[PDB]
C-alpha cells in the first residue's frame with residue numbers, strides 16, 4: 001500500500017512459506033477494498049526455460065481474452081501489453097528462478113505513472129535485484145518457536161497428540177517432541193514433513209526418534225522428497241560453488257563460521 | 259456444492275488441487291472420505307485426526323460368511339448343530 | 345521388537361543403528377504387513393494370511409528358506425533340505441538330538457530356541473557355517489557348545505535360559521562377534537577373564553546367572569572398550585564399589601542383578617547414581633540385605649523394572665516422598681521377603697502397570713493407611729501365599745486394569761475394586777473361590793458382574 005516502488009520482491013530459503021504467503025495474500029485481497037481491477041496468479045516455476053505459452057494462456061484466461069492457438073508469441077505479447085496497460089493489475093509471479101523480460105512474455109513493467117503493482121517471489125536475492133525490485137525486497141523469516149510448536153501439533157493424530165499436548169505434568173515425551181520440532185528450525189516444509197512422518201508415534205519410540213533425528217534425518221520417511229524439493233538451490237551453482245558449499249558442513253552444528 | 263467424494267484405495271500422496279478436487283475446510287460443509295492400505299498415506303492427506311482402522315471380522319461373522327461360499331450339498335454336512343461330527 | 349532388531353543388526357540389514365530397525369518395524373506396521381500386539385507396544389505379531397504370503401514369496405524367491413517353527417517336530421529335517429537354503433528356523437520345536445553335519449555354505453541365520461529336548465549335537469557342527477552371522481540356542485536343555493573355531497562371520501550369540509556349563513576356548517578366536525547374551529544361566533561355571541580375548545563385543549549379559557563377577561578379580565571388562573551394553577550379576581560389595589568409579593563401562597550397566605550377595609546389608613541408588621543407563625534391577629537370595637535406600641537424587645537413569653526375591657533379613661526400603669527415582673517404575677515384583685513392613689511408597693508410582701507378589705509374609709498392604717488416581721495405568725496385580733497381607737490398598741481408579749490373580753491370602757479381606765469405576769478394558773480375573781467369597785465388598789454389584797463376566801476360578 002504505502003510503497004513508492006511498485007515492484008515488490010519476496011525471497012526466502014527453500015520451502016519457507018513463500019507460495020503459501022502468496023496464496024494467503026491473494027485470498028486476503030478479496031476482503032479489503034481496493035482499486036485493482038484484476039488479480040493474476042502466475043507460476044513461472046513450472047520451467048527454467050520460460051514456458052511462455054502457459055503464462056500467456058493464464059493471463060488471457062484471467063483477462064477474458066479469446067485465446068488463439070496459431071497466433072505468434074510476440075504478437076500475443078504485444079496484445080497483452082496493450083491490454084494490461086489499460087487496467088490496474090496485481091500480478092503475483094510465483095517462484096521466479098531466472099531473470100526474464102516481462103515485456104517478452106507480455107506483462108508490462110509497471111511504472112510510477114501507473115497504479116499497477118507486481119509482486120514476485122524467488123529463492124535468490126540476485127533474481128529479485130535483476131527485476132528492478134531492489135528497494136521493495138522482503139526477506140521471508142522462518143517461523144518462531146511458538147508458531148513452530150503450534151504447527152507441529154497439527155500434524156499428529158489424536159492418539160499421539162494426547163501424549164504430547166498436556167501441560168502442568170512433565171513427561172519425557174513432550175521434551176523429546178520439542179527436541180524433534182526444534183531440529184526443524186521453524187522451516188514450514190521441514191515441520192510438515194517431520195510431523196507427518198512421526199504422526200503415528202507411540203510413547204515408547206519418542207526417545208529413539210528424538211535421538212536419531214538430532215543426528216541423521218536421512219532415515220525419516222518423506223525427507224527424500226523434501227531434499228529433492230530444495231535440491232535445485234544446490235544444482236544452480238557451478239561445481240566450484242558446489243564444492244565450496246559442502247565444505248561448510250565440516251563445521252560444528254548450530255555454531256558460527258568466520 | 260457440498261460434495262462427498264469417496265477416494266478409493268489411494269497408494270501415494272497426490273495433490274487434491276492438481277487433479278481438481280478442492281480440499282474441504284472447516285468453513286465448508288463438504289466431507290472427503292479416502293481409503294488406503296498405509297497409515298502414512300492417510301497422514302499425508304491431512305486426515306491424522308479422523309483415522310479409522312479397518313478391523314478384521316470376528317469369529318461369528320467369519321463363520322457366517324464362510325457358509326455362504328458352500329454348495330447346498332456341502333453346506334448340509336457342515337451346518338447341523340446338536341450332533342457333533344468331525 | 346528388541347529380538348528382531350538385534351537379529352537385523354547382526355545380519356547387517358541395519359547400519360549399526362537400532363533406530364533404523366524401529367523405523368523399519370514402524371513402516372511395516374503402517375503398511376499393515378505387521379501388527380502391534382501385546383500388553384505393551386514392544387511386541388508385534390504377524391497375521392496368518394500375511395505369514396502365508398511371506399512364505400509364498402520365499403518359495404517364489406531364489407533364496408530358499410527352511411522355516412519349520414512350532415510344527416510339533418520331534419525329529420529335525422534331514423541335512424539334504426538344509427544344504428541349499430539361506431536361513432533355517434526350527435525354533436519352538438520338540439527335537440531331542442541332532443546327528444548329521446550339514447554342508448550349508450550359504451546359511452546366514454539359524455534359530456534353535458524353545459526346544460526343551462535339545463541337549464546333544466554332533467561335533468564339528470559349525471564347520472560348514474562359514475557364512476553364519478546370527479545363531480540362537482536359548483530356552484534349551486544343552487550343556488555345552490561344540491567347537492566353533494570356523495565361525496569367521498558370527499556376530500550374534502545368545503544362550504539365555506540355557507544350562508550352559510563352560511564356554512569353549514574356540515569362542516575367543518571369533519573376532520566378528522558383537523552380541524553375547526548369557527542370561528538366566530543356572531549352570532554357568534566358566535571364567536569371564538577370558539572374555540578379554542575379544543575385541544569388538546558390543547553387548548554382554550550375565551543377568552541372573554549362576555556364576556558371574558563375584559569379586560573384583562573376575563572384573564576384567566575394562567579391556568572391552570567396544571562394549572556398550574553389559575549385564576552383570578553381583579555377588580559381593582566390592583564389585584559394586586569398584587564399579588562405582590567414573591568410566592564409560594560403569595555407566596553401561598543397563599541391567600544389574602544381585603544373587604547370593606554377601607556383605608550387602610544395604611544398598612543405595614546414590615551408589616548407583618553413576619549408572620545412567622540402569623533400567624532393570626533384580627535381587628535374589630541376597631539374605632545379607634537389611635535395608636534399601638532410594639534417594640531423592642534424580643539420577644539420569646529412569647528405573648522401570650525392579651524385582652526382589654528371597655530377602656528374609658531385608659527390613660524396609662526408604663523412598664523420598666516429594667520426588668523419587670521410582671517415578672518411572674513400570675513393574676514391581678516382591679517375593680519371599682518376610683521382614684518387609686513398608687511398601688506404602690508404591691502409591692507414588694504413577695506409571696505402574698504390572699505387579700506379582702508371592703509369600704511376602706510381613707506386608708500389611710501394598711499401600712497402607714497430583715489430582716489423579718495413584719495407579720491409572722495399572723494392568724495387573726498378583727498376590728499368592730501372603731499370610732499377613734491384610735489388604736491391597738485403598739480404593740483407587742484403575743481404568744486400564746485387565747487381570748488380577750490372588751490365591752491363598754486369608755488375611756486379604758478386601759480389594760480396591762469398586763463399581764464406581766468405568767469397566768470396558770477388563771478381560772479376566774483369576775483366584776480361588778474361597779478367597780473370592782471371603783472378600784468384603786462395598787457393593788454387591790461388584791460381586792455379580794465380576795463373578796459372572798470376568799472371574800476365572802482355579
Ligand SMILES: Nc1ncnc2c1ncn2[C@@H]1O[C@H](COP(=O)(O)OP(=O)(O)OP(=O)(O)O)[C@@H](O)[C@H]1O
Pocket residue numbers: 012013014015016017018019020021045095123151188189192229
Ligand atoms: N504458516 C504456515 N503454516 C503452516 N504450513 C505452512 C506455513 N507456511 C508454509 N507452510 C507450508 O509450507 C509448505 C511449502 O509451501 P511454501 O509456499 O511455504 O513453499 P515455498 O517456500 O514457496 O517453496 P518453493 O520455493 O519450493 O516454491 C506447504 O506444504 C505449506 O503447508
